[PDB]
Amino acid sequence: RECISIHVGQAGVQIGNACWELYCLEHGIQPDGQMPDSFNTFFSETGAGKHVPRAVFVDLEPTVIDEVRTGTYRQLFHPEQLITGKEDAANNYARGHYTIGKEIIDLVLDRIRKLADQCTGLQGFSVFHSFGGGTGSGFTSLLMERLSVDYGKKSKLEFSIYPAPQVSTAVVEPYNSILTTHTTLEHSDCAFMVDNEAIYDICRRNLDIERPTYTNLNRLIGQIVSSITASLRFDGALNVDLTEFQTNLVPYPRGHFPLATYAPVISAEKAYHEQLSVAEITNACFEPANQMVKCDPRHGKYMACCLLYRGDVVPKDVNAAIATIKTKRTIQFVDWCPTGFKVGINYEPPTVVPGGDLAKVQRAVCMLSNTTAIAEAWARLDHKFDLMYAKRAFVHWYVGEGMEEGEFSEAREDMAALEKDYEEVGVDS
Amino acid sequence: RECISIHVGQAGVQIGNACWELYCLEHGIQPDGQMPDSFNTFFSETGAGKHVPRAVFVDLEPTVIDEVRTGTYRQLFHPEQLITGKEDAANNYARGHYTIGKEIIDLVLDRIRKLADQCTGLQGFSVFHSFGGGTGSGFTSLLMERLSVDYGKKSKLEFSIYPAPQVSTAVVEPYNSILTTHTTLEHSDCAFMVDNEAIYDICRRNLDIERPTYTNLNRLIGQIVSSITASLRFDGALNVDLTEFQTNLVPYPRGHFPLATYAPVISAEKAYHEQLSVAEITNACFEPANQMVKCDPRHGKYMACCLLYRGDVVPKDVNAAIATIKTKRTIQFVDWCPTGFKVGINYEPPTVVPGGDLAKVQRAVCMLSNTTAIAEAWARLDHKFDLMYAKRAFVHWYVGEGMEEGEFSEAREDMAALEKDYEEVGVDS
Amino acid sequence: KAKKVRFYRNGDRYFKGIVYAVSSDRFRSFDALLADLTRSLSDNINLPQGVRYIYTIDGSRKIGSMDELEEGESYVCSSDNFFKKVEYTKNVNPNWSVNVKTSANM
Amino acid sequence: REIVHIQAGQCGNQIGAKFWEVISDEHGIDPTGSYHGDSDLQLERINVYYNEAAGNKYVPRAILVDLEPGTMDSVRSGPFGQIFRPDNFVFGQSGAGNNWAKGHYTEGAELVDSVLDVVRKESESCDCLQGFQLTHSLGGGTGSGMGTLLISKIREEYPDRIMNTFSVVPSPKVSDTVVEPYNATLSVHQLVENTDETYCIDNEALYDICFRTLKLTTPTYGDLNHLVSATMSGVTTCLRFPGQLNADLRKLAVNMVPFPRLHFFMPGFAPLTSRGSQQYRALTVPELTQQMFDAKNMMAACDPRHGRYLTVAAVFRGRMSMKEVDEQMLNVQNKNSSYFVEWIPNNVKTAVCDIPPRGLKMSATFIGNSTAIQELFKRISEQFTAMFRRKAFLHWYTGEGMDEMEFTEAESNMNDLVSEYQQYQD
Amino acid sequence: REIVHIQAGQCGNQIGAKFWEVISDEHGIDPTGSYHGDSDLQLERINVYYNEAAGNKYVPRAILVDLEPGTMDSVRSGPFGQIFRPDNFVFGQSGAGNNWAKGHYTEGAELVDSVLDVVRKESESCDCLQGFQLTHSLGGGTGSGMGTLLISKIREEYPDRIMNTFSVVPSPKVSDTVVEPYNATLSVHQLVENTDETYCIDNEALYDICFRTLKLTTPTYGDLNHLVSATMSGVTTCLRFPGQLNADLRKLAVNMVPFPRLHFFMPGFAPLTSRGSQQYRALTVPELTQQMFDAKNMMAACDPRHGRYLTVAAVFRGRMSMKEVDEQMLNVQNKNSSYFVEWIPNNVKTAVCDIPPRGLKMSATFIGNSTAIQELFKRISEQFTAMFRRKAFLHWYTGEGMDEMEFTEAESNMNDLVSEYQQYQD
Ligand SMILES: Nc1nc2c(ncn2[C@@H]2O[C@H](COP(=O)(O)OP(=O)(O)OP(=O)(O)O)[C@@H](O)[C@H]2O)c(=O)[nH]1
Ligand SMILES: Nc1nc2c(ncn2[C@@H]2O[C@H](COP(=O)(O)OP(=O)(O)OP(=O)(O)O)[C@@H](O)[C@H]2O)c(=O)[nH]1
Ligand SMILES: Nc1nc2c(ncn2[C@@H]2O[C@H](COP(=O)(O)OP(=O)(O)O)[C@@H](O)[C@H]2O)c(=O)[nH]1
Numbered sequence A, B: 001r002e003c004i005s006i007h008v009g010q011a012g013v014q015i016g017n018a019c020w021e022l023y024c025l026e027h028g029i030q031p032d033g034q035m036p037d038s039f040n041t042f043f044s045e046t047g048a049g050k051h052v053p054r055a056v057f058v059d060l061e062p063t064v065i066d067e068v069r070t071g072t073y074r075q076l077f078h079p080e081q082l083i084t085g086k087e088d089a090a091n092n093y094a095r096g097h098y099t100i101g102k103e104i105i106d107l108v109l110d111r112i113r114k115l116a117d118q119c120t121g122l123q124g125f126s127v128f129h130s131f132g133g134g135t136g137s138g139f140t141s142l143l144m145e146r147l148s149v150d151y152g153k154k155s156k157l158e159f160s161i162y163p164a165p166q167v168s169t170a171v172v173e174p175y176n177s178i179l180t181t182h183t184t185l186e187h188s189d190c191a192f193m194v195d196n197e198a199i200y201d202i203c204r205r206n207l208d209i210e211r212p213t214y215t216n217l218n219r220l221i222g223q224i225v226s227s228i229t230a231s232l233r234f235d236g237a238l239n240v241d242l243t244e245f246q247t248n249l250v251p252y253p254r255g256h257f258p259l260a261t262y263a264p265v266i267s268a269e270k271a272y273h274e275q276l277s278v279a280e281i282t283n284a285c286f287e288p289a290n291q292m293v294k295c296d297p298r299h300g301k302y303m304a305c306c307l308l309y310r311g312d313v314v315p316k317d318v319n320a321a322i323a324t325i326k327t328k329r330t331i332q333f334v335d336w337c338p339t340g341f342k343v344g345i346n347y348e349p350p351t352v353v354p355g356g357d358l359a360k361v362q363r364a365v366c367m368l369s370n371t372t373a374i375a376e377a378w379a380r381l382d383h384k385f386d387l388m389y390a391k392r393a394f395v396h397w398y399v400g401e402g403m404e405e406g407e408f409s410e411a412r413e414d415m416a417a418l419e420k421d422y423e424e425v426g427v428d429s
Numbered sequence C: 001k002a003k004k005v006r007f008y009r010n011g012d013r014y015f016k017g018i019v020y021a022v023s024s025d026r027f028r029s030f031d032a033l034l035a036d037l038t039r040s041l042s043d044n045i046n047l048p049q050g051v052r053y054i055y056t057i058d059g060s061r062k063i064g065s066m067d068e069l070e071e072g073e074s075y076v077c078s079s080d081n082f083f084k085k086v087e088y089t090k091n092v093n094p095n096w097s098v099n100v101k102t103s104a105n106m
Numbered sequence D, E: 001r002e003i004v005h006i007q008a009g010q011c012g013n014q015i016g017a018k019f020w021e022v023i024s025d026e027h028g029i030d031p032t033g034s035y036h037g038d039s040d041l042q043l044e045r046i047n048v049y050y051n052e053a054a055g056n057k058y059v060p061r062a063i064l065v066d067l068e069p070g071t072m073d074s075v076r077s078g079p080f081g082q083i084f085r086p087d088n089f090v091f092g093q094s095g096a097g098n099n100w101a102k103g104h105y106t107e108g109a110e111l112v113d114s115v116l117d118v119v120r121k122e123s124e125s126c127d128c129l130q131g132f133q134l135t136h137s138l139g140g141g142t143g144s145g146m147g148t149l150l151i152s153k154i155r156e157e158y159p160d161r162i163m164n165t166f167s168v169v170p171s172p173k174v175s176d177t178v179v180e181p182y183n184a185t186l187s188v189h190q191l192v193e194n195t196d197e198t199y200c201i202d203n204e205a206l207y208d209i210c211f212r213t214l215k216l217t218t219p220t221y222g223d224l225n226h227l228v229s230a231t232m233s234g235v236t237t238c239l240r241f242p243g244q245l246n247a248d249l250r251k252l253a254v255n256m257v258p259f260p261r262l263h264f265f266m267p268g269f270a271p272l273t274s275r276g277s278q279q280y281r282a283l284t285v286p287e288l289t290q291q292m293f294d295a296k297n298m299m300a301a302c303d304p305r306h307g308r309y310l311t312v313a314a315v316f317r318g319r320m321s322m323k324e325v326d327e328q329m330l331n332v333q334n335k336n337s338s339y340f341v342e343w344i345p346n347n348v349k350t351a352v353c354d355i356p357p358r359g360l361k362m363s364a365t366f367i368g369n370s371t372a373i374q375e376l377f378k379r380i381s382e383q384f385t386a387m388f389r390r391k392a393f394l395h396w397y398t399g400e401g402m403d404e405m406e407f408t409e410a411e412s413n414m415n416d417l418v419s420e421y422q423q424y425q426d
């Protein structure tokens, strides 16, 4: 029934604090834990007054988890559930996965085994990491790694924030992301992806603001995510379990990575304008300028979409708005796939931050999907890697951290067959 | 049912703000969008309490569209629908059509495809441009151009303000107007024409005022236009659809250009005088000093007139007042045309600005028509062109803007057969 | 008249040199020219002390007399200098001396 | 849109102080203060001449080029002198010798790179650049030579953005210098081939227009300058205001230059009445065209009545009837069909702003492209030959690394320029 | 994490006083006082440079190595001089002769054990050690020789913890000593083979950058030092602060050193504007990259424009958009594709702290690993040979128990080091 969550890496933690915020916000549970089953699949009714979170936090520098235990919400989690390794983060996979990251893992696991026990027939762990980091790429790599073995019998949906197409940060980023992909690939169930840059566009083009603090992108994913777990694990006219996803969403064992998209992104101050039609939002979903991912459907044929709706929506409206789409053709779906549209309908409309910059409509569409499109995104990220590896660039930083020419070269070959995979499962009939 | 409108060029925008004003004014919708189908063919009920316009605004200098988003009405349109190219206007076709104007077009179209979708079975786009301008001549040229292909299956009535017969402004004007005619000719359905100068006469002779601000001429067309769309798309005793026009108004594919005329133009302060008879106004329509066009029926045989009446009018009064005319002979109608009188009767009388200078009668006649007369107006405007082209005058200004000796010489030949066309379809039996 | 020359700094392959004029009325000797060249070519990367000697375009021989400076010439500034030799300068047009080229009717 | 003024030489500089003295007030910008603007419209378009740094400090985006310290050190030590960011001052403490050659080949050529540097810092400021304003005198070193270079470089760096040039062509009757035609002929040469809009002003055409059209008895330089700066404000800045029919540098350019030479104009202001008395207010409009189109009142030396026009641009700026404007222009075009050239059906380019010169009700800048200015380059060109023939003060040029073929070049060029201009007077 | 500063020699020492003068204020630590910190964040990470004993006495964890009493007795008898625990002062009252050999083999070799002793007392302080900061000049005894030994020993004791080296490579134009290239070539040798991050500063690259980028007319040493210390604060200490994207010595190391030599960088500070006036605040960000990436402003002597880069690390520290940061860096990488080496798709290592330099709004330390520094070791290496050839002041070395093959060694080594660095410029 439930779904634990492990927010790994400063980022996965910032995004975590965010997604975690939106939560209580739409569940009437002040930062003090108290509100005045349903949603029990994400919150445990500990003591007789509060609602201790149902997740954990893993960063190797204290800085970021520290800030959580300062700002209201400080009261929300258990002093315990926020894991730290005073040591060093290191923007390098190796160190975070092998060398350092190792020391903590046990302890980390312990919670996802201590928190996994306390519950009642769970469904999986929503993992939150930032592909191109040290604690986010490496560590998790083995966290998800140690999970796929300790609970192979569950769902492993990892929600990632993969490398901005041109606006990356770390100098090595690819090293860290070609490595978190190959090690997690054979361990995840469904990997959701939200592109940091391609989200900015949305903040520039669909909300207008050249002042987007990280704290915003987080509010956004913090939204799209709320549409995944939160509301879905919440009763409705067309419920969709976590398993449901991976089933209706992955055509093949590769921990396939769909893309997250939201429909109503419109800025407060617009807040009064006449609302958008069920048809418009539906249509907005097929626009490559509103998908939290720089993977513009440049050719990538969709192969399965899970249209999660929430708010006031008439099933016919959908079983029509989608019909219209199924026949737009310029939206070309894979061949071997007749119908690939999982319509998920929830009741409770979205819930926008009291005064951030999100419109606040009475219905939204968080559609996610597997698109032969990422054939690109992976490509462009793989190429990166080579260029540097081709010169070993910052290689001495990993080797000296318990890695080898193996893990790199052999994780490169890995993704290679991910460029062929995402190519074969499509483009051909 | 509806008819979008694209006001292009500062002028087409000033006139736009005007025609757009008269609108709400006679529909009880304050500048705040709110009023306390019918007219839905020009206004979309965004929800909701408002009445977002049903048109767009295209200028390459911000100045003029800017002023709209300052003065009440600021609230009327959507922040979006007013397109601008911070760049440069340039009183030259070429630059506006080719070089610069190009960059914006896509975006422009997008709205007339985004606004064209939202509606319900539309009828066409009432285009507003100023023949002899940069953004008005050039740009549109390709806007209407890109329309005739994207919606060949509709009406393209472009409402133009063609070059004052002697009181032109731009030094090049003809270059810009022989070019907007040839490029739009093979794309428009019916091109309405209102002569800026010949309207002044009306302000001097039929209203008395040597103080006519542009803001007035605009109130005027702003009137004649209200008689076209507004009221017509509005129920009545003898409705006339947009298609109706082009059908009952163009004898031949040349995007034929009728002339706009209004009957009751009498100044407030006269406002009390005993009103004019159904016969007088009817007769006023056959006077070459009241037609918003310096094309005095110097010989031009009418070939089709669409007498749009509004207010308290008895069909017999018309089907008599017109009969009397049909037999004045000195009003000679074409040969091949037995009867060319489309009687359009509306109910609601006109609606004059609260305190401008328009009389405010309880009935009016906005008669428009195709007259072999323009054989002149075109002639006199073509000749202009030659004189300058004959010396290349400001040619280097276009060439250096992605044009050639072709487009000029080959658009001259174009109109040439417009001087023969408007000659052959008449003067002969 | 004077003599138009294009003075390059040894070991630069970037700076297109600076054009100077040279005569008996402007500079009594090479040391006086070199003194003004130290001010106009004043640097601390290609030239140690700014300009101490002038070498041929190839750096095979240093000039000691103004009589060796020809019109529309190319010279190099040195102070050791050790020579790379840096040519470079290229490429520029000979239009500093005069425009050889003209416009054409294209 | 935007522009970046350029104060070449002393004159061009002295005038800078007056052009900015004005313009600022026509934009409510106190010395270092901000926008005190009596209105709210004198701000939505300022950018054209300033930059945002502090929030009360909109600094003029111009360049101050000069090889004579004392000058810029008089402009920087007086009134509005403390608004320009020091970075703007591109001085040349060298000997600002009065030689075109000394400020174009030998002395100025050095200070150039340290100028272009800034002209780029300002161009790459923000938004979109339109062109650069250039003030100077064609009768000196830092003016004709070094400023004429500044452009030859500018026009290689952005052959897209425009180049208005405000030149103080050597007044006839008396020359405020001696080699004048040398420094001049040499700079006009550079002009006819780089800038694409030049507004030639004459210190004595001004006096006249300032001592008889303004009973002003003691017309100090400050004044002349002031009058000039009044016109260059009507031109640019003005059109960067709203209007029933507004234009902008290009319109002005693309309506005024029939043939690529660049052609030079002759600016004329509208209400030019003496203070107290004259304040006749006869400014309905026929009064402004009456003004603008008369001989006297043309900042140029030559008289329009002495040669047809190719183009005219009445850039009015004050609420008026597009009818009484568009109309007047006509009669004017017919009462004087004689001189107004024919192969252009409508020579005149009517332009119409809205807001007028701060304290006035109605004005209208005049930018005429008449063939009359033939009779000026003639003048200049004459003075040259009469003295070139004997190589008068030529040693001050050559001795500065010049050429005997350089002077030949310019004269001819600029001399041919006279020729052409006649090709239309006929 | 942690680090333990090392003040080798006088210079390295003099600078200690400035590096600690600063850093403290950037951590609210008064002379012997405690944390007066205007904030609460300048404390959660101090440990990196101090130790807890009393409760108001956080003592700098550095080492003061020098064979000349007077020096440390000037640093200990002045301002912040009374904050170092006396145990820190590892003096050598011997004759601190200006010989690399006198402070590396004969005189310093003795005082070493009594140093390592402490460098261990400080390392075994607590928590986890990161690395050691090393300040000194490669143009003297106690600096190049004895300090270059201190590391050769450190790097044998903890080949795990890092080693940043701040060297004052012998300025070109005029050297502040005579054997300079002797004491230098010999120390660089030791560097290229022990420390793994070196930041080379030039007393004259500073003057320049301090007399023209700070209209400062009397740049005392204190200043230079002060400027330098400003950069080393942005580097270390800084990153030991929070940040959207923070790094730390290693990141800096593991992103900046493509090949094991150790490679030397060239630090550059961001807001480097003269006091009053200049306080332009043009620090939106494009202004900082404008700064940092220009030639002048590189504490090094050589000019980047004279050789590609291998890596760059803009360690910014002041609230900014991970977009306007990540973005700018790009254009920069494309406007100068020429020099930025290609076999590294993203040379730049963007780093971003949060809290800025106490009194400033936005800054950004620059740590460049350009191939340009080839043209410096060349210099040094040249000076050597030109004088080695004649064994100039060699008797002061040998006579101190040295070797004729020792000098050979170093030059070659460091000389080869020049070679390699070119292997990438191409
Ligand atoms: N959407 C979003 N992206 C973030 C956020 N914080 C960081 N990122 C992105 O995630 C990546 C940064 O990872 P880091 O913060 O360097 O590292 P980490 O993954 O936390 O782990 P370490 O390297 O060991 O510190 C970059 O691509 C950032 O653009 C955040 O709050 N929201
Ligand atoms: N009736 C009417 N005519 C106008 C109005 N504004 C301008 N005109 C006329 O339209 C023409 C002017 O076009 P411009 O304003 O120069 O140019 P534009 O068409 O807006 O486009 P650009 O040249 O690029 O600025 C002239 O013939 C004017 O007389 C107006 O508000 N009403
Ligand atoms: N209108 C006007 N002319 C000036 C001013 N100053 C010098 N002039 C004119 O400029 C010419 C002299 O050139 P000058 O400006 O001294 O040259 P420069 O300073 O060496 O570049 C003379 O014709 C003067 O009448 C001024 O402030 N206003």
Ligand SMILES: Nc1nc2c(ncn2[C@@H]2O[C@H](COP(=O)(O)OP(=O)(O)O)[C@@H](O)[C@H]2O)c(=O)[nH]1
Pocket: E008, E009, E010, E011, E012, E014, E015, E096, E097, E098, E137, E139, E140, E141, E142, E143, E144, E168, E170, E171, E175, E176, E177, E203, E221, E222, E224, E225
């Ligand atoms: N920046 C800087 N350089 C210094 C200082 N003191 C000496 N130097 C430089 O160091 C070199 C001399 O070495 P020195 O420090 O006296 O050697 P030591 O004291 O025998 O180890 C010269 O190049 C000086 O410019 C200082 O306080 N700041």
